Design a protein around this ligand. Structure first.
Ligand SMILES: [Cd+2]
Ligand SMILES: [Cd+2]
Ligand SMILES: [Cd+2]
Ligand SMILES: [Cd+2]
Length: 31
């Protein structure tokens, strides 16, 4: 399933959950 509508998939920065706080269209924690 999609972790966030900003990251693709299998994002290590979203593997242990969702450490993405940046945004939805563009973040800066999974650049
Ligand atoms: Cd994201
Ligand atoms: Cd991510
Ligand atoms: Cd996420
Ligand atoms: Cd991020």
């Amino acid at each position: 399933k999609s972790c966030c509508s900003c990251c693709p998939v299998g994002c290590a920065k979203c593997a242990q959950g969702c450490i993405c706080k940046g945004a939805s269209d563009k973040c800066s924690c999974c650049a």
